[PDB]
Design a protein around this ligand. Structure first.
Ligand code: NA
Ligand code: NA
Length: 327
DNA sequence: CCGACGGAGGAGCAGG
DNA sequence: CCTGCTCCTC
DNA sequence: GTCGG
């Protein structure tokens, strides 16, 4: 489906999804609009009526009449009303700052704070995460081309190995699927001395090392198993400096590693279909484990995983390269 | 009509 | 001073 | 909001 096929409908749906998530605080309506927006973005026809799209799974009654109004008028009275509503469109924008969710964006707006400059003039009311998110507001919305993502992986792998050569570090996300651009770098990390029962400064030593070589610049949150922070590639001679990028590093036990590697590689749709055969054939998948069913349904014990396709094999799927796990 | 819709690690303070 | 849940992210 | 009980 081309850039201008049902793009008017899909943009409007995701715009409704954003309003529901940020303003209404209805993550399930938000996921519902995203689902209908996704299934229409794979529909190989131009829609002429709401009932035409309602055949698709995820599109129902209320969305069909929203599609019907859009076709007739090229707009939606409600959606256009939401745009011009100063307090709703303010809550929407403020959530684009990392660390400002739907709950904090309303507090800011009700006490008059509605812009970045308003936030920069009220640093006292921001926590550490939100001060960083405000600082790199422009950088964090930029995409990361693959060439820079691979240079970023060069540093991560090089410094990870030089702390302990038995660390296993895998960069996941769309980058692992050959995507020409990413939004952030996701790092999955494990060590043979950490299992479901296991000197776990392991995440700390890795984070510290990338800080000393000045890859990591800021810390949004840091704990035993999960790191979220900011990084930046070094600048070359007199050329302008690279934008700061979001990076997360997780320490997963060695047994649950390839479940996590599978899950955090995506795509989620690809996980929604793969998740949805496992149960078809008697297995339940989550981020951590593959577990057998379950003649009523409820299950017991996690099984051994030593490779990503170890999971593919019990489900009995020809291993799919990350190259083609778009769905 | 009603319940499910992914879910957990980490940060952090209003109430008393 | 003590308590302990909401928020955010991906 | 939608789907499935
Ligand atoms: Na439908
Ligand atoms: Na945000």
């Amino acid at each position: 489906p081309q850039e201008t096929l049902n793009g008017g409908i899909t943009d409007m749906l995701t715009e409704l999804a954003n309003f529901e998530k940020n303003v209404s605080q209805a993550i399930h309506k938000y996921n519902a609009y995203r689902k209908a927006a996704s299934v229409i973005a794979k529909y190989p026809h131009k829609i002429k009526s709401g009932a035409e799209a309602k055949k698709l799974p995820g599109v129902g009654t209320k969305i069909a009449e929203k599609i019907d109004e859009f076709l007739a008028t090229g707009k939606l009275r409600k959606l256009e009303k939401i745009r011009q509503d100063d307090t709703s469109s303010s809550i929407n924008f403020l959530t684009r700052v990392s660390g400002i969710g739907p709950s904090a964006a309303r507090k800011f707006v009700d006490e008059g704070i509605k812009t970045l400059e308003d936030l920069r003039k009220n640093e006292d009311k921001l926590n550490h995460h939100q001060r960083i998110g405000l600082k790199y507001f422009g950088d964090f919305e930029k995409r990361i081309p693959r060439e820079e993502m691979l240079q970023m992986q060069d540093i991560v792998l090089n410094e990870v190995k030089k702390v302990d050569s038995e660390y296993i570090a895998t960069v996941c996300g769309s980058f692992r699927r050959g995507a020409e651009s990413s939004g952030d770098m996701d790092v999955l990390l494990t060590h043979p001395s950490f299992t479901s029962e296991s000197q776990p400064k392991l995440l700390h030593q890795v984070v510290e090392q990338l800080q000393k070589v000045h890859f990591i610049t800021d810390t949004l949150s840091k704990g035993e198993t999960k790191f979220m922070g900011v990084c930046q590639l070094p600048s070359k001679n007199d050329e302008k400096e690279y934008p700061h990028r979001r990076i997360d590093i997780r320490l997963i036990p060695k047994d649950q590693y390839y479940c996590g590697v599978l899950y955090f590689t995506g795509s989620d749709i690809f996980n929604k279909n793969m998740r949805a055969h496992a149960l078809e054939k008697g297995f339940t998948i989550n981020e951590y484990t593959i577990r057998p069913l379950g003649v009523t349904g409820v299950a017991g014990e996690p099984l051994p995983v030593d490779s990503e396709k170890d999971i593919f094999d019990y489900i009995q799927w020809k291993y799919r390269e990350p190259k083609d796990r778009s769905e």
